[PDB]
Amino acid sequence: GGDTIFGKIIRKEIPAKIIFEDDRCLAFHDISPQAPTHFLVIPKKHISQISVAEDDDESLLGHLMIVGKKCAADLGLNKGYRMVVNEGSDGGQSVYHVHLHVLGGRQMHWPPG
Amino acid sequence: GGDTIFGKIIRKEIPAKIIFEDDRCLAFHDISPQAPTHFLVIPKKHISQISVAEDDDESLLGHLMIVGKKCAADLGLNKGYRMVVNEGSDGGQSVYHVHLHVLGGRQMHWPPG
Incomplete structure (x- = not known):
């Protein structure tokens, strides 16, 4: 799904x-x-960044979160976790494939970077 | 829309x-x-935390992200931004209504807290 390491x-x-x-x-460990637990959930559809996501991608994006909440439970994360999407340079997006x-x-800390 | 601050x-x-x-x-400033720019996008429906979100809530969750990216573009965040959903204690979730x-x-840093 794309020309990034995530597509491979x-x-x-x-x-x-x-x-x-x-x-x-697809969900896989970072x-x-x-x-201690750090994983990624990415769509197979190549959406380079959240800023260009179409309105039609809405449920798919919601799907990433539902899958993420489920994967977290099966990875034993019963005390909590943090979901993060990074956009562009200021967001510190490392790969141009939505993730x-x-x-x-x-214990995750505040501010989130 | 709920028993919390956000409900109010x-x-x-x-x-x-x-x-x-x-x-x-609803999208409002934190x-x-x-x-410099920090706002929240919350569902009007009261889901207390993402770990209890139902499978049917996926459109609503993806909607939070579609609205967040639109608002960010409107607020002129053209260099990037970071989206964060905190779950439970370890996630640093203090308000029990999904935001x-x-x-x-x-520049947002790594790790995200």
Whole structure:
């Protein structure tokens, strides 16, 4: 799903620690974890960034969160977690393929960066 | 729309600087901003936290993000921003009514708290 490292992962061209997959999204552990549990849920549709998401993508985006909340429970995150979407330079988006970060396993702090 | 602070804001009982409102959500400025621009997008329907969101809530959740990105564009966040949903204690969720944080106007750092 795209010309980024995330597309190669969806195409199983390179390995990743896959947590969940369905016909429209993929959840896998972040290769550079920022908490004891740090995973990503990404759509298979290549949406480069949240800023260009069409209105029609609405339920799909909601799907990423539902899948994220479910994956978090099965990863033992019963005390809480933080969901994050980064947009552009100021947002610190590392890959231009929409991705929802889910982090937990430790006390997350405020401000969120 | 609920038993919390946000329920009161939705019912216009306590003031808030509204950026956007529709039949499903409300977007307003955070009173303790963590960036030059910092606003919240909450559903009018009272979901206490994302971990208890139902499968049917996916359109509403994705709607929070579609509204957040639109509002961010309207607020002139062209360099980027970060969206955050906090869950439970470890997530640093203090208000028990699902909210989405949209922060921008400065460089956001890694990790996100």
